[PDB]
Design a protein around this ligand. Sequence first.
Ligand code: FK5
Lengths: 121, 123
Amino acid sequence: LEQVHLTEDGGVVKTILRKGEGGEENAPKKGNEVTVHYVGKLESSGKVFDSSRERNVPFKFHLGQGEVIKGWDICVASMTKNEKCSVRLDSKYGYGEEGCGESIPGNSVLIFEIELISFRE
Amino acid sequence: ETLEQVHLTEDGGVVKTILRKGEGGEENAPKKGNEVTVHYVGKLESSGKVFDSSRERNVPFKFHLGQGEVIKGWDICVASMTKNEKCSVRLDSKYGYGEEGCGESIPGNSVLIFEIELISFRE
Ligand SMILES: C=CC[C@@H]1/C=C(\C)C[C@H](C)C[C@H](OC)[C@H]2O[C@@](O)(C(=O)C(=O)N3CCCC[C@H]3C(=O)O[C@H](/C(C)=C/[C@@H]3CC[C@@H](O)[C@H](OC)C3)[C@H](C)[C@@H](O)CC1=O)[C@H](C)C[C@@H]2OC
């Protein structure tokens, strides 16, 4: 599968697992509410640190607001409805030097499988 | 004048101070597995600085109780609450983010104070 670089520094690289729907009415825009399912794991250990699938409830947020880690705003802006991708985020686009809890160490590369389920204004 | 500081663990690491009593009736207490809806304000005991408020962004927080969907101190605290209860819970770092902390705002080895209000719950 082809790697799609979403920044010039290699820090956000999206692999499309399942292509989403075509057409502009199917790509979300800045400020829209998006609904996704995701599974986040560390690249280095493969261990899952957060999963909406495990909670059995999708996650909603407003796109392009900084409500989520930078790599998520960048990744989801590139997706279309029903797309499922695996995105690799350098720590610069994740939790940085600090990390968050033992399950997200400082300077960790994160891998998220993200499925864009739907969006609305 | 009522101070009620409820020690929810033997190690002193989760102490819930009750600010407003919940509605009476055991029917106003959630069970493990129930989805609960809360508002919260989180701050560091050491500096007193707020690091997050669900109120400020106007987005209530929901999770399924007692399933590890949240830091352990939260599962313990919220299991002890009843509908409309408002508390301030003190969590030692072992019930929060431990030696790692979380992001720029929460250093390693931080005691956390959360004001939590249990708004509603369901099956
Ligand atoms: C794609 C979105 C991510 C997804 C984000 C949301 C659902 C939005 C939700 C309102 C989170 C807040 O978003 C503004 C924000 O809340 C804090 O400010 C906060 O006050 C906090 O302490 N909370 C939130 C309220 C419940 C308790 C606790 C928590 O249990 O949070 C959990 C938490 C961070 C657990 C870590 C996970 C890493 C482990 O290593 C560590 O292990 C110890 C434990 C949260 C709920 C995760 O389950 C889910 C997510 O992270 C964190 C300081 C940072 C966190 O944003 C990251």
